[PDB]
mmCIF file of C-alpha atoms in Angstrom:
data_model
loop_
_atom_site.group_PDB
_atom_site.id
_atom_site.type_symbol
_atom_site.label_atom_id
_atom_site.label_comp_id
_atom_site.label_asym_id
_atom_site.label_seq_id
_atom_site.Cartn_x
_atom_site.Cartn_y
_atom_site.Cartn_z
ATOM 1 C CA UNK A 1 -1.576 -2.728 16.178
ATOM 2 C CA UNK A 2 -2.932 -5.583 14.225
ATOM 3 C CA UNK A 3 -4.531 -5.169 10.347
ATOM 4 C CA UNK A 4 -2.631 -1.633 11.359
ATOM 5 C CA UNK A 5 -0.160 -2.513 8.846
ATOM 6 C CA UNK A 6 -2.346 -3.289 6.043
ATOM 7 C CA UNK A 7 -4.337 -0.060 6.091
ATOM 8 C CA UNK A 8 -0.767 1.815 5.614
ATOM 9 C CA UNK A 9 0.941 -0.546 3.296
ATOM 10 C CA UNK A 10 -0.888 -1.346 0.151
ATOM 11 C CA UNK A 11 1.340 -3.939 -0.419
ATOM 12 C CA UNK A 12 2.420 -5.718 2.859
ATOM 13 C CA UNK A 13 5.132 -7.336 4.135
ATOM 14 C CA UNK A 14 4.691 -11.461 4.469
ATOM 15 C CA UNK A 15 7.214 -11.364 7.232
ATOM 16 C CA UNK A 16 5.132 -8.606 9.128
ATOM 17 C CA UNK A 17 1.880 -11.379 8.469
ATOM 18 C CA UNK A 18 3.766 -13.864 9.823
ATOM 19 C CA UNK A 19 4.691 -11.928 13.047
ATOM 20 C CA UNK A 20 1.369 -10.818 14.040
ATOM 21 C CA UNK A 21 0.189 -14.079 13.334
ATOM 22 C CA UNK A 22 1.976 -15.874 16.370
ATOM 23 C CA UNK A 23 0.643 -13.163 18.425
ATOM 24 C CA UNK A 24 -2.967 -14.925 18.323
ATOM 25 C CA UNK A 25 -3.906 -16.206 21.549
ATOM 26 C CA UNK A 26 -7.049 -17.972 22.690
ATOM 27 C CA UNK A 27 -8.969 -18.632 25.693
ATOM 28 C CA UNK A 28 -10.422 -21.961 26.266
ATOM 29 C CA UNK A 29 -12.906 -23.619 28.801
ATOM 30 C CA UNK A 30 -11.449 -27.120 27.667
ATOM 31 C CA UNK A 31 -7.328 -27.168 27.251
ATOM 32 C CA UNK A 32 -7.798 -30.262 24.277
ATOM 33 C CA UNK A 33 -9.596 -27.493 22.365
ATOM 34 C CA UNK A 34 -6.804 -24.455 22.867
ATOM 35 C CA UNK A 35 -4.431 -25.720 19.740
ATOM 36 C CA UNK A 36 -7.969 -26.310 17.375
ATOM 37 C CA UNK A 37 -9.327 -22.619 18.506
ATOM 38 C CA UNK A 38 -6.025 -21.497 17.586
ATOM 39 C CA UNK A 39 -6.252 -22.556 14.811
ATOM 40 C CA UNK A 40 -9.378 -21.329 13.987
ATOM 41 C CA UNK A 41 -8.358 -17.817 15.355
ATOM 42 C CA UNK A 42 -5.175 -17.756 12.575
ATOM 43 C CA UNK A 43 -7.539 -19.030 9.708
ATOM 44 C CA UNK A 44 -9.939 -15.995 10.771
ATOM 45 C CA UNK A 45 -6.769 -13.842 10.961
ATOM 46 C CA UNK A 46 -5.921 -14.786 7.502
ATOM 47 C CA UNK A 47 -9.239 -14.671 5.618
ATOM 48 C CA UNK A 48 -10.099 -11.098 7.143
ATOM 49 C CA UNK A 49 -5.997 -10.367 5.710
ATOM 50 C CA UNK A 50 -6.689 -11.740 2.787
ATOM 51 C CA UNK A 51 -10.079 -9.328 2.575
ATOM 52 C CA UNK A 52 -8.166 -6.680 2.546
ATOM 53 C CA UNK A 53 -5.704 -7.385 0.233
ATOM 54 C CA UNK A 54 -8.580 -8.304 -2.225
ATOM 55 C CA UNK A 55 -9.551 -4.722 -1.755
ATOM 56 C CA UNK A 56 -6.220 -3.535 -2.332
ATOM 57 C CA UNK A 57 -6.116 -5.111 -5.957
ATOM 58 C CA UNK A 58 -9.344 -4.286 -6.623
ATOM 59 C CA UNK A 59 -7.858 -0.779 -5.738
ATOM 60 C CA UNK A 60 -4.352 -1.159 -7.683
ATOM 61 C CA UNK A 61 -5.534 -0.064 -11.582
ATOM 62 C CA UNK A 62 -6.022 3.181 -9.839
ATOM 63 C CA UNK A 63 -3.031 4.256 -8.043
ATOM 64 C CA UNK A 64 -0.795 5.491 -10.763
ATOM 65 C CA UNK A 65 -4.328 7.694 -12.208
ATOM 66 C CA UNK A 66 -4.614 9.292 -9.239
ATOM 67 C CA UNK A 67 -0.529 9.823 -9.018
ATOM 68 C CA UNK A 68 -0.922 11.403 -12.528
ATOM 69 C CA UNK A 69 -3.873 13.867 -11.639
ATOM 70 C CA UNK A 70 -1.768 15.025 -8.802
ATOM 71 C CA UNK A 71 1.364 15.814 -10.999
ATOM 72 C CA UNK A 72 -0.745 17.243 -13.277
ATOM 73 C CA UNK A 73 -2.370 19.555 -10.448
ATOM 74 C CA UNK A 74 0.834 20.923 -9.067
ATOM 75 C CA UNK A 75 2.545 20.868 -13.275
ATOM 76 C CA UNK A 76 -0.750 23.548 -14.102
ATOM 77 C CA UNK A 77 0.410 25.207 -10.194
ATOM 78 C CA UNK A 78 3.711 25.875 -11.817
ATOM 79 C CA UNK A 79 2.397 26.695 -15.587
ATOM 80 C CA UNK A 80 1.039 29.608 -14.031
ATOM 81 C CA UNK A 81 4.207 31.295 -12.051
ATOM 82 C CA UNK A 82 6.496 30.484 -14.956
ATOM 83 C CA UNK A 83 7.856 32.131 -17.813
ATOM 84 C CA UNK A 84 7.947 30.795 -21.371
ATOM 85 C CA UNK A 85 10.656 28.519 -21.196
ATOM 86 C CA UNK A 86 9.232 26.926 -18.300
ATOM 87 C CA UNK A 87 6.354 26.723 -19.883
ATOM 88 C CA UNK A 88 8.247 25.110 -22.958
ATOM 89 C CA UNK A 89 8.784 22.017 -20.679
ATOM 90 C CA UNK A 90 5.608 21.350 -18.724
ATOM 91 C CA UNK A 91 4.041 21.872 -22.658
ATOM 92 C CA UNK A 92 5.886 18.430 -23.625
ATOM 93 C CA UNK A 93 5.011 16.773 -20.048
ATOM 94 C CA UNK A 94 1.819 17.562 -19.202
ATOM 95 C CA UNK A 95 -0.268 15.804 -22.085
ATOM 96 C CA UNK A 96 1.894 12.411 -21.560
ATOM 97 C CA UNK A 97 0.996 13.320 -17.351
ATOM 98 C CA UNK A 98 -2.806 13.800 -18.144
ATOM 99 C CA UNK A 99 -3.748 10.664 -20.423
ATOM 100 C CA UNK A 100 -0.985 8.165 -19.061
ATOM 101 C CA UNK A 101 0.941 7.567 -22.326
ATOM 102 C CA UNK A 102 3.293 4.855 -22.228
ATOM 103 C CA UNK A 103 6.527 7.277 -21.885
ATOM 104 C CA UNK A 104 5.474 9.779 -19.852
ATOM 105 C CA UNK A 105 7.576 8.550 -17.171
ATOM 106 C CA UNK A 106 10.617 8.902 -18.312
ATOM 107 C CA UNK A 107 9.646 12.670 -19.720
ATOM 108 C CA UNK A 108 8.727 13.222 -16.313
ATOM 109 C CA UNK A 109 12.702 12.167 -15.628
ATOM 110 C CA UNK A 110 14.311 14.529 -17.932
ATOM 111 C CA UNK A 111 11.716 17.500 -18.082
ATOM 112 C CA UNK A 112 11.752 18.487 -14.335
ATOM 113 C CA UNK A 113 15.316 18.601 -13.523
ATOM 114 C CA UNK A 114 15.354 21.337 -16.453
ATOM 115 C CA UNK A 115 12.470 23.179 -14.850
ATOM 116 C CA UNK A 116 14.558 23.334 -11.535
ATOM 117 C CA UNK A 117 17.475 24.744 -13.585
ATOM 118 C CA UNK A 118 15.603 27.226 -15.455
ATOM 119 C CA UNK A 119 14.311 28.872 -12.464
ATOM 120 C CA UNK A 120 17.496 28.851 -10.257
ATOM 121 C CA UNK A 121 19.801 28.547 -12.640
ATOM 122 C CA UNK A 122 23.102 29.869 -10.050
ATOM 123 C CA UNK A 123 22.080 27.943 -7.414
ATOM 124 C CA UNK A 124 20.568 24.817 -8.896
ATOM 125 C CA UNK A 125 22.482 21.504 -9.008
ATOM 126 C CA UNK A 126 14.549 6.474 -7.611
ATOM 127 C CA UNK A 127 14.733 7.767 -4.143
ATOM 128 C CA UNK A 128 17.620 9.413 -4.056
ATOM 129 C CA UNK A 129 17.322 10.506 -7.441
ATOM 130 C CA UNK A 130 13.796 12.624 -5.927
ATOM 131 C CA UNK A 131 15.176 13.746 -2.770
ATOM 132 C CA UNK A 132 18.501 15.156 -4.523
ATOM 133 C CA UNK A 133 16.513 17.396 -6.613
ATOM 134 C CA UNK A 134 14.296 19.464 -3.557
ATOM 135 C CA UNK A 135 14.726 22.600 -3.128
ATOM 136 C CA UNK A 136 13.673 24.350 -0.025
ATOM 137 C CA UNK A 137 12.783 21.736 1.893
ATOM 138 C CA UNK A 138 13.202 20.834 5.373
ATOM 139 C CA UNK A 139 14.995 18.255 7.418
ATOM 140 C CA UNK A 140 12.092 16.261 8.722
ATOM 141 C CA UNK A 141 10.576 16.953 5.351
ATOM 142 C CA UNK A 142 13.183 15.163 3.336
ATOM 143 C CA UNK A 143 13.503 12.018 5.936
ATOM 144 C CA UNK A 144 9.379 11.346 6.330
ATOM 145 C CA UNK A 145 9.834 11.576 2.131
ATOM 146 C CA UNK A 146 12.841 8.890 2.355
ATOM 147 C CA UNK A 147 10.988 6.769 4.973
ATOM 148 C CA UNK A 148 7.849 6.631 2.947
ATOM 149 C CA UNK A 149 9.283 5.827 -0.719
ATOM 150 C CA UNK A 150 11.976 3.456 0.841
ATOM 151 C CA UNK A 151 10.414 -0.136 -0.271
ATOM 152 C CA UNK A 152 12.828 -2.306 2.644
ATOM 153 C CA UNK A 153 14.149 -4.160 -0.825
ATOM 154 C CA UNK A 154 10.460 -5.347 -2.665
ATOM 155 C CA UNK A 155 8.801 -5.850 0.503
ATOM 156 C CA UNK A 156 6.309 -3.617 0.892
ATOM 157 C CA UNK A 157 4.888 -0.250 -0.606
ATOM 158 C CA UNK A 158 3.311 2.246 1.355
ATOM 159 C CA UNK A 159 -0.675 3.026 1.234
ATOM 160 C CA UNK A 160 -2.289 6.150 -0.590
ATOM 161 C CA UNK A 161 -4.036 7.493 2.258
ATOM 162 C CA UNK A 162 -0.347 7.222 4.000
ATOM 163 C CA UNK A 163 1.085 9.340 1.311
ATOM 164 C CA UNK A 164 -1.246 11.697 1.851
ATOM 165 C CA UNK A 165 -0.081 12.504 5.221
ATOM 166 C CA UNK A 166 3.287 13.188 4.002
ATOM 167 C CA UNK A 167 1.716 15.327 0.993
ATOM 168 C CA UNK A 168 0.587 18.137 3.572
ATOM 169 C CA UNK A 169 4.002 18.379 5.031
ATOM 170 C CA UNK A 170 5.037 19.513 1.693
ATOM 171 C CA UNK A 171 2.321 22.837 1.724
ATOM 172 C CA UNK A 172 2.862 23.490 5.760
ATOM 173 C CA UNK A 173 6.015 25.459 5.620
ATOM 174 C CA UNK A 174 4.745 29.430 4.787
ATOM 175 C CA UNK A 175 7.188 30.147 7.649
ATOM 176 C CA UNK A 176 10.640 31.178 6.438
ATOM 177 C CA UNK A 177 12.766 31.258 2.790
ATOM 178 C CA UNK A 178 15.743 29.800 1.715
ATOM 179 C CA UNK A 179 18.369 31.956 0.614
ATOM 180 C CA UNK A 180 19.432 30.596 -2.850
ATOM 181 C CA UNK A 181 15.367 28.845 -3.635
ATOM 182 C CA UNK A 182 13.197 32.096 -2.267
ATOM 183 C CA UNK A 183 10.779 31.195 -4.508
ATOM 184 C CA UNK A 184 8.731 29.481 -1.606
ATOM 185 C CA UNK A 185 5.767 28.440 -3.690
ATOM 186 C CA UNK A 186 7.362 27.226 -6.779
ATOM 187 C CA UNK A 187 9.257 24.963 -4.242
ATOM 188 C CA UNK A 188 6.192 23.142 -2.987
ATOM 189 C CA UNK A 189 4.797 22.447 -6.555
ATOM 190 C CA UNK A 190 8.335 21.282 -8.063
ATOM 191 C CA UNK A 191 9.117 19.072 -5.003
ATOM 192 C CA UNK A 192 5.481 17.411 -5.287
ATOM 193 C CA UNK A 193 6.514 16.988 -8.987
ATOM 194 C CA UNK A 194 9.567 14.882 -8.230
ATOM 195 C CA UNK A 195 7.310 13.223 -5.112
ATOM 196 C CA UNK A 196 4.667 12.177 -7.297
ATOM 197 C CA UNK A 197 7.321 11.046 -10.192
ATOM 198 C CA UNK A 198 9.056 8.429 -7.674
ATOM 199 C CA UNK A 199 5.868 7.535 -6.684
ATOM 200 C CA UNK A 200 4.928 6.431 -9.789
ATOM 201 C CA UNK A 201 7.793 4.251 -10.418
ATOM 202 C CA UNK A 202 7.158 2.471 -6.944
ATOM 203 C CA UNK A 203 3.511 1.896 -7.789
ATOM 204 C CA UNK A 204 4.495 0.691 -11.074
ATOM 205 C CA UNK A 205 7.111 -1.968 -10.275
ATOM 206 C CA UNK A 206 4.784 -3.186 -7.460
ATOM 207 C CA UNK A 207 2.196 -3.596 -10.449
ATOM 208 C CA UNK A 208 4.561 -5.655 -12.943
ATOM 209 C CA UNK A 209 6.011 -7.283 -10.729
ATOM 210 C CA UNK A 210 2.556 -8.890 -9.415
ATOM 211 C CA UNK A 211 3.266 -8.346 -5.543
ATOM 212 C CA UNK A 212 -0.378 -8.455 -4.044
ATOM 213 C CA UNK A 213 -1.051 -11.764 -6.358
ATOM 214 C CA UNK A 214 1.898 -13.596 -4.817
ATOM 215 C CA UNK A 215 1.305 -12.430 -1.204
ATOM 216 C CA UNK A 216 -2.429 -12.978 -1.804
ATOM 217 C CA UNK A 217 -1.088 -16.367 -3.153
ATOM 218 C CA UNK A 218 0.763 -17.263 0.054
ATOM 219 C CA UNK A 219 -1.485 -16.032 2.488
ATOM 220 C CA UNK A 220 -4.166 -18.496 1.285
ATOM 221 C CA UNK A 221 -1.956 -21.622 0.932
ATOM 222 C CA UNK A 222 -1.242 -21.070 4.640
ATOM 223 C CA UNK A 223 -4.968 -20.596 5.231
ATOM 224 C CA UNK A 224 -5.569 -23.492 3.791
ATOM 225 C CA UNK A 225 -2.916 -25.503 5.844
ATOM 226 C CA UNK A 226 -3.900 -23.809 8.760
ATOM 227 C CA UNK A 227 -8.070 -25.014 8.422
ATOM 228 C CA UNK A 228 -6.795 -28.071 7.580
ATOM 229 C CA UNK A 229 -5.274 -28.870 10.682
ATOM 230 C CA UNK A 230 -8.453 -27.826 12.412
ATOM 231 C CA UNK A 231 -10.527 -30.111 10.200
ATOM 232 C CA UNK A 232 -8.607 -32.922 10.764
ATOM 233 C CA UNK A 233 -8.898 -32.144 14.967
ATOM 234 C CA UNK A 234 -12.815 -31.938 14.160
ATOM 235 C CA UNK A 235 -13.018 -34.819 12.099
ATOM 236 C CA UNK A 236 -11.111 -37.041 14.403
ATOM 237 C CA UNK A 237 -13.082 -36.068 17.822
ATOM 238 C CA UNK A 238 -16.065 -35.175 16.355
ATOM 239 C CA UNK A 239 -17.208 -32.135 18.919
ATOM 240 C CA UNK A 240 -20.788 -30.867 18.970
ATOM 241 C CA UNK A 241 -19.791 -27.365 17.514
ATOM 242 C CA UNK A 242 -23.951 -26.469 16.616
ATOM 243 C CA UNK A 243 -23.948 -28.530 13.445
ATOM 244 C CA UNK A 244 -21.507 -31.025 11.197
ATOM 245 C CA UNK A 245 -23.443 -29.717 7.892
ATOM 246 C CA UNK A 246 -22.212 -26.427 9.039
ATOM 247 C CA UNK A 247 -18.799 -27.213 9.734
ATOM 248 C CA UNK A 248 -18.701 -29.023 6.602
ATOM 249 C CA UNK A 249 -20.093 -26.476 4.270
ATOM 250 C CA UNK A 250 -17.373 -23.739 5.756
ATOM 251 C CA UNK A 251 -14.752 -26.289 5.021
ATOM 252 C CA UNK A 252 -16.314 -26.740 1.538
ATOM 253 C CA UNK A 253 -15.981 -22.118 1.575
ATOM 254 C CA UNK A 254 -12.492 -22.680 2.137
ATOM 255 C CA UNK A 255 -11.905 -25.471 -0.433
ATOM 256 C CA UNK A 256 -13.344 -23.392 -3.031
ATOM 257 C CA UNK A 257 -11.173 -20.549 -2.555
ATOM 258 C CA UNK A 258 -8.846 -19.839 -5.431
ATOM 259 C CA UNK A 259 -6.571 -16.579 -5.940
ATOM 260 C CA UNK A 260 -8.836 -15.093 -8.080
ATOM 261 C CA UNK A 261 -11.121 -15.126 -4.937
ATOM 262 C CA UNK A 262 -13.790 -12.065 -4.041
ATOM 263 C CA UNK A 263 -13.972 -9.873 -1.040
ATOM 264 C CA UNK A 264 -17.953 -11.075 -0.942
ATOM 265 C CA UNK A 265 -16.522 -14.922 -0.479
ATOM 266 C CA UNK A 266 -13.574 -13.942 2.513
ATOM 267 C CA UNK A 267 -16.151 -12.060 4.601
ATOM 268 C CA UNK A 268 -18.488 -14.841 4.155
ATOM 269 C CA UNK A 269 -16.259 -17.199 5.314
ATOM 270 C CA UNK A 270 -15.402 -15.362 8.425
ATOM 271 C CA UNK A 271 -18.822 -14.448 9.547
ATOM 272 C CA UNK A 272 -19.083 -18.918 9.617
ATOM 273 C CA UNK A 273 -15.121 -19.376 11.251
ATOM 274 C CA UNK A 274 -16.305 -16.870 13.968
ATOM 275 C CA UNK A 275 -19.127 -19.380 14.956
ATOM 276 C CA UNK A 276 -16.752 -22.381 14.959
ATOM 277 C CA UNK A 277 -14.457 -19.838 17.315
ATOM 278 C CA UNK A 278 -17.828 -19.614 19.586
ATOM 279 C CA UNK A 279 -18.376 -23.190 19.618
ATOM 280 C CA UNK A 280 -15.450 -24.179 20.597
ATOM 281 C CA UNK A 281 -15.183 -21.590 23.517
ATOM 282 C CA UNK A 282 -18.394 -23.776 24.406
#
């Protein structure tokens, strides 16, 4: 489904934009105006995208917060049904975990594969790197993990609210016990642990590497290409869309937009493309 994409990616892919952007279709009284609605229709396609993705960097300073609070949660869940060598470890996490210190990461990286050993230690042996250290976890649990943290190579990253339907697939299994991890609780809070660990590193990369600027970046130079070619149409045959002041002051919105651009400006400018899209259905 269209936009569908965007509300479960936080980063999307610009091939995926691309695609549902030929999908656009229009229906016209007058054939000579089907390519200039079209156009019209893909600009409005791209400013309500680019809305969104606004909203996702306005969003982005607080994706790895709300990752730590979460590791934090389950790190106190496990404080609790631990002895004091467990507790030894989650002592030296937790604090980095809480504020956000610069290193906490990597802490993260070395501290939890010692709390798995400590508690099983017979039977106890990135996204591999996460999925290699569950314990009691299912089958369909382990690929909707893989699905979700696999990034197809830098081009995407998946949503909060979507990991949050994977999250209660971790605490919906108080049906049956593993042999060698019967610790069934324990389980869920370690395995969110490593979850919330290689979600942090996604998140993070996606951050440095400045993903939503540079698809936000794209996204308007083909908006702009895209109005253009409707502007020139207009200019050239000079329709009676309503008003030329108003078809000149939204292509004056759309000159003015720059990356650093505001939610408040996008769904401005579409409210004025959708009455060009009117107009030119006559």
């Amino acid at each position: 489904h269209l936009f569908n994409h965007l509300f479960r990616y936080h980063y999307p892919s610009w091939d995926q934009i691309l695609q549902e952007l030929d999908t656009l279709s229009v229906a016209t009284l007058n054939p000579d105006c089907h390519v200039p609605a079209l156009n019209v229709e893909k600009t409005l396609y791209l400013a309500k995208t680019i809305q969104i993705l606004v909203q996702h960097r306005q969003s982005e300073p607080y994706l790895v917060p709300a990752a730590r609070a979460n590791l934090a949660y389950s790190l106190q869940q496990l404080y609790k049904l631990g002895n004091d060598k467990i507790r030894g470890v989650i002592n030296g996490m937790l604090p980095l975990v809480d504020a956000g210190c610069i290193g906490f990461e990597r802490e993260l990286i070395k501290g939890l594969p010692r709390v798995l050993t400590l508690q099983y230690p017979h039977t106890a042996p990135c996204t591999e790197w996460c999925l290699s250290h569950f314990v009691g976890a299912s089958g369909r649990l382990r690929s909707e993990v893989r699905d979700i943290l696999t990034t197809h190579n830098g081009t995407c990253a998946p949503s909060f609210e979507w990991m949050a339907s994977v999250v209660k697939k971790f605490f919906l299994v108080e049906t049956v016990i593993y042999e060698d991890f019967q610790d069934t609780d324990f389980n869920v809070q370690l395995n969110l642990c490593f979850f919330w660990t290689a979600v942090v590193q996604m998140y993070q990369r996606c951050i440095y590497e400045q993903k939503l600027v540079h698809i936000i970046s794209t996204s308007l130079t083909l908006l702009k290409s895209t109005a253009r070619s409707f502007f020139a149409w207009y200019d050239l045959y000079r329709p009676n869309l309503g008003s030329a002041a108003l078809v000149k002051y939204t292509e004056h919105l759309i000159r003015a937009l720059t990356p650093d651009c505001s939610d408040v400006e996008l769904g401005e400018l579409c409210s004025h493309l959708h009455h060009c899209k009117h107009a030119l259905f006559s």
